[PDB]
Design a binder for this molecule. Sequence first.
Ligand SMILES: O=c1ccn([C@@H]2O[C@H](COP(=O)(O)OP(=O)(O)O)[C@@H](O)[C@H]2O)c(=O)[nH]1
Length: 328
Amino acid sequence: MKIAIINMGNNVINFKTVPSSETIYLFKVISEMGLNVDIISLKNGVYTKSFDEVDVNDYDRLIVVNSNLAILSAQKFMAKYKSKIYYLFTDIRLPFSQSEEELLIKSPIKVISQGINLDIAKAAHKKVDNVIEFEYFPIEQYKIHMNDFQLSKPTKKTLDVIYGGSFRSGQRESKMVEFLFDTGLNIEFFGNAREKQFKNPKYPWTKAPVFTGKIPMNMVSEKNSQAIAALIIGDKNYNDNFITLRVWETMASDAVMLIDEEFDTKHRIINDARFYVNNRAELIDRVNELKHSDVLRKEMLSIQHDILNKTRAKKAEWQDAFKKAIDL
Ligand SMILES: O=c1ccn([C@@H]2O[C@H](COP(=O)(O)OP(=O)(O)O)[C@@H](O)[C@H]2O)c(=O)[nH]1
């Protein structure tokens, strides 16, 4: 059984970019499952093999992630594969889609949805003509199942709330402004967003949080740990659907995880109302409570790390479910 992983939109080579990084981490966790795996990209290197140095049909399973030569190359390569393509649907904005006959992909496609609501995964892929089947699998838990995963230790607090990410093309501007702007709290927004991007008239604000630059994927939980709390919000279609990597990066940190009620109305992540907030007012009160009650803050951290540990204790079941999802 030989498996190959391709990144459809970006060149994979190092841990410089987030797309290249998450691809090497998937590869790492899949390898640690005891599977013979290769990443195919533009160049041969210490992590990758080039498209021209391999025969697409030597692989029994072809896994595709998404995050231009890399695109053209991947399409051309996939177009020659004679079996089913397993697409990891990790971002609602990145469903599978085709880029004339040398690029036309005719193979059936299995979309492994990170979101539990398969109707949303279907609607996003409605323009796909290929035979396509859907299945849910919590792909994002790959970070916590990695062999060298370590929980973040107690850190000195220099911030109240923190959030790391990008602007997502304004996909969640409403929520960012509601919870991170004009709170009168000491907030930091790290990543690719910039204050200037928040120009939508529908969401007025007076004072913005502090925008700092992006950090490596492997530094996120350590960065989150500088604050009392770290916020979990999502796009509209993530609500009650996707559990994102930020949930685990936050849960593993020394920052108490505060979740937008709308993101998880059933309280699937943690069945404890103290971790959820409905609006800006509740976020403020909740952070003030945490700042002034160490017993509370420490109790909540202990509860979230516990949940994290119980999930990590089901690694074998997670690995099996992954193998089954790729027809093994
Ligand atoms: O400077 C940063 C900020 C974010 N991230 C990664 O980007 C993810 C968030 O991506 P996004 O902004 O697209 O939002 P999401 O849909 O995941 O909540 C984080 O969880 C991190 O893993 C990172 O590596 N460095």
